[PDB]
UniProtKB/Swiss-Prot annotation:
It is found in: Membrane; Cell projection, Cilium, Photoreceptor outer segment. The gene is RHO. This is Rhodopsin. Residues 1-19 are annotated as: Interaction with SAG. Expressed in rod-shaped photoreceptor cells in the retina that mediate vision in dim light (at protein level). It comes from the Eukaryota. Photoreceptor required for image-forming vision at low light intensity. Required for photoreceptor cell viability after birth. Light-induced isomerization of 11-cis to all-trans retinal triggers a conformational change that activates signaling via G-proteins. Subsequent receptor phosphorylation mediates displacement of the bound G-protein alpha subunit by the arrestin SAG and terminates signaling. Coiled coil: none annotated. The modification Phosphothreonine is found at residues 6-7, 11, 13. The chain holds residues 330 to 348 of 348 of the full protein.
Length: 19
């Protein structure tokens, strides 16, 4: 949800892509 491109795939790196 935080990472514009992907909501499903929610990893630590996925969080990093916002902040």
């Amino acid at each position: 949800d935080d990472e514009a491109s992907t909501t499903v795939s929610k990893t630590e790196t996925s969080q990093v892509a916002p902040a």
